[PDB]
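ping. complex inputs:
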Amino acid sequence: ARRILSVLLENESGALSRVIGLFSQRGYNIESLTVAPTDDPTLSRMTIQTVGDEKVLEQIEKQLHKLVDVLRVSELGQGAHVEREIMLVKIQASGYGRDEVKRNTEIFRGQIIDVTPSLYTVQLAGTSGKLDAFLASIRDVAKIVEVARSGVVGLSRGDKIMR
Amino acid sequence: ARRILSVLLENESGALSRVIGLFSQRGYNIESLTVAPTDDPTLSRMTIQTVGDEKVLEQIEKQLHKLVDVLRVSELGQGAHVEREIMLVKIQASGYGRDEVKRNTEIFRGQIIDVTPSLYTVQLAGTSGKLDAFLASIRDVAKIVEVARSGVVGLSRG
Ligand SMILES: [Mg+2]
Ligand SMILES: [Mg+2]
Ligand SMILES: [Mg+2]
Ligand SMILES: [Mg+2]
Ligand SMILES: [Mg+2]
Ligand SMILES: [Mg+2]
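pong. complex structure:
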């Protein structure tokens, strides 16, 4: 009931609208989406995380191919793949809590990118589950003031290449 | 030039489609877009990076405040802020180029997350400029085969 689609799309104004518009017209759900330029045959690459019925989630890919700005579409889960997200989290802590936040940041291989006497801003990259586990490890020991999270970026492993 | 908006919105489309529609109907360049779930199962946070078009963006933003599915809107480029991105880059990595890719990954403090005897996939997080510099340093030396970049996310400084 969860699918991850990679899309290679021409950078033109309107292209992102047409893709999102296609989902808006079925209630194809968008759990997360990332899109940004590649090293640029003027193309961008999009990663879309969708959740719902396997039936409608399979109508998706055929319809994406109809869009003139869409160059390639690949369902990442049908082969070996990697998925990552980045998160920034501002955390207020004192005493033992500051200790725990620092320790957990080390454990999760994050880094602190801003520091005041009462606040840390932590940058963490990993799978969604890794980021969720970081939040869970500190939520009841320190105060989470704000979270900014990217949503999933994905690529196939090895010589499976969307070109 | 460069503007970054963060938007909190009720998560379905129509909602996402309505926000992005405000940009496309003006033919306004979107360079990157990220959208992810928040604490609240009903709310998403979107971050959009655009190159404009000065005051046209101002008209888009007041228009954003008028949208029923939008809860809050912020310009990141009003801090005093931190902005970061992540990229996955798959690179043809043979002979001299394999040495070079490994060395440059070390230099930029990335990490290799997939290996074959002729390919590396590098994970790199940093500012947008850091990622750009990594690609510039390698693109003429080893063949970049795939790039998946997140788009920027950000927070104010404390
Ligand atoms: Mg074209
Ligand atoms: Mg120590
Ligand atoms: Mg040597
Ligand atoms: Mg050597
Ligand atoms: Mg060495
Ligand atoms: Mg060249």
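Helices of chain A lie at 15-24, 54-66, 96-107, 128-138.
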